[PDB]
């Protein structure tokens, strides 16, 4: 019987946590993340998924190195020691 | 290996196929005695080396 009975037998995870995006979207049997496409080289990114794109694009994380480059550019990529 | 087979089977195609005369004329070369005589003359006129 579909419905309340069938829901009882749901105790086997089909997806687990991804090692690249940390989301519970890694299909265990396919060995592929439904979110980012891991273990492919490229990231899963579709132009019809504009909202999905902005949820995880650049700037949504720490941006640690790109902030460093921005500060270094604004002074001209200088090296050495100030007097 | 494949490169060895390719060398040897290439030699066989040149032996089997009908070679045009412009290419087949290169299969008849200078004789041994004349070749040695020619190279004896040439070695007297080798060009100067980089050091010289």
């Amino acid at each position: 019987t579909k419905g309340t009975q069938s829901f009882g037998m749901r105790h086997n995870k089909s997806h687990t946590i991804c090692r690249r995006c940390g989301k519970r979207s890694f299909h265990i049997q396919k060995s592929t993340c439904a979110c980012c496409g891991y273990p492919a080289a490229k990231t899963r990114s579709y132009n019809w998924g504009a909202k999905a794109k902005r949820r995880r694009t650049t700037g949504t994380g720490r941006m640690s190195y790109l902030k460093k480059v921005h500060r270094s550019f604004k002074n001209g990529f200088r090296s050495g020691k100030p007097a | 290996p494949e490169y060895i087979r390719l060398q040897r089977r290439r030699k066989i195609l040149n032996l089997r196929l009908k070679v045009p005369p412009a290419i087949a004329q290169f299969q008849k070369t200078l004789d041994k005695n004349t070749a040695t005589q020619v190279f004896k003359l040439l070695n007297k006129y080798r060009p100067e080396t980089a050091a010289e």
């Binding site: 480059v69 270094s72 990529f77 090296s79 | -």
Partner: protein
């Protein structure tokens, strides 16, 4: 409070043993923190942690400067000692090989350069 310049005028062995002593003091202070410590000791924890950072920084500067001296005037130097501006800049043509010209172009510019001129009213 350890002063970084006073650190700079010490030896590597002296810095190493001071680092070990500072680590021992930090360990004892953390023991106080778990056993119940006073505000003075908890305030000394941060100062000890910063002193260890200063010791480790001074050691690193000496090690990297020694590496720079050893690799000075060498064709190949360690990657961390090389420039790191941007990946694209590193791949770019250098000004020397950007200014390379053929003998044809050198003669043309030698004999017919852009003259400075002006017009009368």
């Amino acid at each position: 409070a350890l002063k970084t310049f006073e650190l700079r005028k010490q030896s590597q062995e002296n810095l190493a043993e001071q680092l070990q002593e500072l680590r021992q003091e930090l360990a004892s202070l953390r023991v106080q923190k778990i056993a119940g410590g006073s505000g003075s000791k908890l305030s000394k924890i941060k100062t000890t942690r910063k002193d260890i950072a200063r010791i480790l920084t001074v050691i690193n500067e000496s090690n990297r400067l020694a590496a720079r001296e050893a690799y000075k005037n060498k064709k190949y130097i360690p990657l961390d000692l090389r420039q790191k501006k941007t990946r694209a800049i590193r791949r770019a043509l250098t000004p020397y090989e950007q200014s390379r010209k053929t003998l044809k172009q050198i003669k043309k510019e030698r004999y017919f350069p852009l003259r400075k001129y002006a017009l009368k009213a």
